[PDB]
Amino acid sequence: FAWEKQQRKTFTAWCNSHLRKAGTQIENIDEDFRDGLKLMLLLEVISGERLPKPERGKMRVHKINNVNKALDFIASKGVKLVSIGAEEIVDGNAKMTLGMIWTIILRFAIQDISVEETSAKEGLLLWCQRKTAPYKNVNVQNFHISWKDGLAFNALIHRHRPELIEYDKLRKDDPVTNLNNAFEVAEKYLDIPKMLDAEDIVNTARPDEEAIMTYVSSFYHAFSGAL
């Protein structure tokens, strides 16, 4: 669907926000993980742990072996992999590749989030509801339509860094302006790379929730070193 365009953009940007720390980047998410090398690198950055030595030989076995090293590692963190195999990743299955990157985001960015007595996706939601409670015209109830007008992004940033956001200036019926304001402020001041397209968000009835959770989780981690 339009899910796929959104996820390609967001998951690439998310991966790159981590790969920069390992001195590299991907450009094409359905080509650039096929040899398994940057996939293994990504896992090393986000876990802080070393994976086995990759094979650099460029034959299909090597790439399969590299991708299995990555999958075996994800599984060692208690992930039950579903409908993901190394051959299909190496062979460029785009939907499966997106699925595998989401699995990685969920485990390594989301799962360990702990807020009051809730964790993971539920904990990330409660955190957003707590931080945005007093803000006019914000009501976070999900990771889709709640985020679509741009105000919750701005409220979330304002609650931590009020000097960066003029919240009262923002118009609910001006969602593209609100979205770009938050995206730009986060990129410049919080070192959170842009992962969402304002137009896509506004021009979709229901924005992709995986893509929204991915971006919001990076806000959670930017703001977690405080207090």
UniProtKB/Swiss-Prot annotation:
Start and end residues of each stretch annotated as Interaction with VCL: 2-16, 63-81
Motif LXXLL motif residues? 39-43
Tissue and organ distribution: Widely expressed.
Q: Which residues carry this modification: N6-acetyllysine?
A: K69, K169
* Ranges where the record places region Polyphosphoinositide (PIP2)-binding: 132-147
Domain Calponin-homology (CH) residues, every copy: 5-109, 118-224
Subcellular localization is given as: Nucleus; Cytoplasm; Cell junction; Cytoplasm, Cytoskeleton, Stress fiber
The record gives the effect of mutating S217P as: In FSGS1; no effect on protein abundance; no effect on homodimerization; loss of localization to the nucleus; prevents nuclear localization of the wild-type protein; decreased interaction with PPARG and RARA; loss of transcriptional coactivator activity; dominant negative effect on nuclear receptors-mediated transcription; increased actin-binding affinity
Where in the sequence is Phosphothreonine found? T204
The annotated consequence of T214I reads: In FSGS1; no effect on protein abundance; no effect on homodimerization; loss of localization to the nucleus; prevents nuclear localization of the wild-type protein; decreased interaction with PPARG and RARA; loss of transcriptional coactivator activity; dominant negative effect on nuclear receptors-mediated transcription; increased actin-binding affinity
Sequence segments annotated as region (Actin-binding) = 2-224
Quaternary structure and interacting proteins, as annotated? Homodimer; antiparallel. Binds TRIM3 at the N-terminus. Interacts with MICALL2 (preferentially in opened conformation); stimulated by RAB13 activation. Identified in a complex with CASK, IQGAP1, MAGI2, NPHS1, SPTAN1 and SPTBN1. Identified in a IGF2BP1-dependent mRNP granule complex containing untranslated mRNAs. Component of the CART complex, at least composed of ACTN4, HGS/HRS, MYO5B and TRIM3. Interacts with MAGI1. Interacts with PDLIM2. Interacts with PPARG and RARA. Binds to VCL; this interaction triggers VCL conformational changes. Interacts with SEPTIN14. Interacts with IGSF8.
What's said on domains?
Contains one Leu-Xaa-Xaa-Leu-Leu (LXXLL) motif that mediates interaction with nuclear receptors.
Task of the protein = F-actin cross-linking protein which is thought to anchor actin to a variety of intracellular structures. This is a bundling protein. Probably involved in vesicular trafficking via its association with the CART complex. The CART complex is necessary for efficient transferrin receptor recycling but not for EGFR degradation. Involved in tight junction assembly in epithelial cells probably through interaction with MICALL2. Links MICALL2 to the actin cytoskeleton and recruits it to the tight junctions.
| Sequence similarity | Belongs to the alpha-actinin family.
State the disease link: Focal segmental glomerulosclerosis 1: A renal pathology defined by the presence of segmental sclerosis in glomeruli and resulting in proteinuria, reduced glomerular filtration rate and progressive decline in renal function. Renal insufficiency often progresses to end-stage renal disease, a highly morbid state requiring either dialysis therapy or kidney transplantation.
Protein name per its UniProtKB record: Alpha-actinin-4
**Can you name the source organism?**
Homo sapiens
